[model samples]
Target: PRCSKHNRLCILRVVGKDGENKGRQFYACPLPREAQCGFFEWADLSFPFCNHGKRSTMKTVLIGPNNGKNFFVCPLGKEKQCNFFQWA
Candidate 1:
């Protein structure tokens, strides 16, 4: 994601808890808590890297559909190590 203030690519990672099967990781502009971005917190389990310019090409499997919204599984699966940034 591009930080509009910094005008550079800022990678954001949403951390997850250990031993949780349904953990989530979200991406967004690397802005301070005072800043706001239009994008929502995307589910990590539904979106995985596709090797195409920071966006994944893997098709998501929709579990439910309503209000034009759907959910899917991450192509990388649960046990896979994601290449995205991991905050310490």
Candidate 2:
């Protein structure tokens, strides 16, 4: 998603400044740090691109036997969906 302040695209960046996630890829707002909108996402968790070449969205199952289990689904409406899904 875009930043709250400028609505611009996010930039894929890597972390190297010391943290448990060091060296992992992530997405962040494309603005100076101080001017950022705090948009962030872990690249690995959003992995396995959809057929439409878009990142998957994660959500937790909240009903039935699958309750509380996490999974990924295409981030699009039915008409535009590429049917990408996977257990997370």
Model 2 alpha-carbon drift over 4 Å, by segment:
1-46
For candidate 1, which ten residues in a row score worst on lDDT?
Answer: 51-60
Candidate 1 wrongly placed segments (more than 4 Å): 3-7, 15-22, 41-88
Local accuracy of candidate 1 as per-residue lDDT tens digits, 17-80: 6654224456566666566554444544445443332333222234454333433333345576
Worst 10 residues of 2 by lDDT: 18-27
**Sequence-dependent TM-score of model 1:** 0.29
Query: lDDT for each of the candidates?
Result: 0.44, 0.73
Please list the Cα RMSD from the true structure of every candidate, rounded to 1 decimal place: 13.8, 12.3
Q: Write the per-residue lDDT of candidate 2 for residues 2-87, one digit (tens) a residue.
A: 65667798886777687655555677899877878778878667377777886666566765888888777776667888888899
TM-score of each: 0.29, 0.46
Cα deviation of 66, candidate 1, in Å:
44
Top-lDDT candidate index:
2
